[PDB]
């Protein structure tokens, strides 16, 4: 038997998610920018740690983001060699911990904002819901084990101990893209978006098309 725990999304997060999922926007590829930008953060963060403690490089000396589409499984996997998050980080940061940015973003929308600033308030993660249906995140932190974080909208998320192959270190996010949003599984589409918003990433990015 596995250890699966279901937690509830904070009020504002649940509300915003419901809005992001039901509201039909135009600029949707923002989700890729948000994720990739957040991926560079994971890398930049591990560096500073390894500078003081080189022993954390045994988890993988490489520092690069990989984009792995899948037209067969209809999934968009994104991998970053950062230090990832712990079980506590996953549960706390992704769901429980309220973000003042989430609250303000909602107010900003009323004041007259845009979707291209969703990650501005710090809510630059759930933007994937604009194109996906169910989010799956697997990460391997140094001072922790391997865990799986998945949520299929609604207002709850599931955290359990990952059984899959060891990842070493890093963040691996597999997006369950919507059946009508397969366009992002296109190499030319992804490459276009990367050369568009992901050109300031000071870390090598590699797309692995089939």
């Amino acid at each position: 038997e596995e250890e699966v725990e279901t937690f509830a999304f904070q009020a504002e997060i649940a509300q915003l998610m419901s809005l992001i999922i039901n509201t039909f926007y135009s600029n949707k590829e923002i989700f890729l920018r948000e994720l990739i930008s957040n991926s560079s953060d994971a890398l930049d963060k591990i560096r500073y740690e390894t500078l003081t403690d080189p022993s954390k490089l045994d988890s993988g000396k490489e520092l690069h983001i990989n984009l792995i589409p899948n037209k067969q499984d209809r999934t968009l996997t994104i991998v970053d060699t950062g230090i990832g998050m712990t079980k506590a980080d996953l549960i706390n940061n992704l769901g429980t911990i309220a973000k003042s940015g989430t609250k303000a973003f909602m107010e900003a929308l009323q004041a007259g904002a845009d979707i291209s600033m969703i990650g501005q308030f710090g809510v630059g993660f759930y933007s994937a819901y604009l194109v996906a249906e169910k989010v799956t995140v697997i990460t391997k932190h140094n001072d922790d084990e391997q865990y799986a974080w998945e949520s299929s909208a609604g207002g709850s998320f599931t955290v359990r101990t990952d059984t899959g192959e060891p990842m070493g270190r890093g963040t691996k996010v597999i997006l369950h893209l919507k059946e009508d949003q397969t366009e992002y599984l296109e190499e030319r589409r992804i490459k276009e978006i990367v050369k568009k918003h992901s050109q300031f990433i000071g870390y090598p990015i590699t797309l692995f098309v089939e």
């Binding site: 003042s100 303000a104 107010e107 900003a108 904002a113 600033m117 501005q120 308030f121």
Partner: protein
Amino acid sequence: HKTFVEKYEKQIKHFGMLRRWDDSQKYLSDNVHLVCEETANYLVIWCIDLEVEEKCALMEQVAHQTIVMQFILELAKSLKVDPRACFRQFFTKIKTADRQYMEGFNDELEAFKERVRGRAKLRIEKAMK
């Protein structure tokens, strides 16, 4: 000054609804005409009104935009060069491993919000009693 606000109000108001470093950096690059004192002034005025509306959630973010403008302007002024040419270095020193600069940035931010709260209470008290 006055004609500036009545020409880019919608732009400035949209600027205060941000918070990321490189994100706002491009916003300032694309709208280099927004790096002015009036801009920072508007953000205060707006923040004070937001606090009264009990929109303390948005007030916290707008302040993270007011301090940015103030800091950039100060940074540029100290360098004795036009802010429009000295607005990207601020976002550079924010990644710098020197957290002292970042802390200095946070301290003013926290104090700014608290100073705002006092102003908002004085505004309502002057008409309440």
